[PDB]
From Swiss-Prot:
Top-level taxon of the source organism: Bacteria
Protein's name according to its UniProt entry: Glycine cleavage system H protein
Name of encoding gene: gcvH
Family recorded in the similarity comment: Belongs to the GcvH family.
InterPro entries according to UniProt: 2-oxoA_DH_lipoyl-BS, Biotin_lipoyl, GCV_H, GCV_H/Fam206, GCV_H_sub, Single_hybrid_motif
Positions bearing N-acetylserine: S3
Record-annotated Lipoyl-binding domain positions: 25-107
Keyword Acetylation: yes
PANTHER family: GLYCINE CLEAVAGE SYSTEM H PROTEIN (PTHR11715), GLYCINE CLEAVAGE SYSTEM H PROTEIN-RELATED (PTHR11715:SF3)
GO BP, one annotated term: glycine decarboxylation via glycine cleavage system
Bound cofactor: record note: Binds 1 lipoyl cofactor covalently.
Assembly notes: The glycine cleavage system is composed of four proteins: P, T, L and H.
Record keywords, A-Z: Acetylation, Lipoyl
Keyword Acetylation: yes
Amino acid sequence: SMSDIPSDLHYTAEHEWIRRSGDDTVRVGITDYAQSALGDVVFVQLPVIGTAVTAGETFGEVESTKSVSDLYAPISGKVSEVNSDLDGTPQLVNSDPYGAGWLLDIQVDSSDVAALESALTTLLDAEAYRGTLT
């Protein structure tokens, strides 16, 4: 099957998606391609809410029975939310990677870190992300 790549998301080459959820907040998850490649997710290590992250910093990891993969901050900011549903139901990452399986939110204060307008420039659009995939 062709992996789902919503056109209304931005992405990283490392298979994270980024949804602007507010003026200063993005929601982050892993892509359909990513979850399928990882396999059934058995554990998601999420950063603590309040964690300051820089773009590309490892903030967590996703684990299947076969694979462990780092999760990188797609943008700089502060972790403002994490998906607690993934504690008991880590497979939401597999079943609904762009919905219920979201990982966390990063909030930007345009003072401490790049404003979202700036931060967005580093991310891939759907077409670009599709182009990176095999």
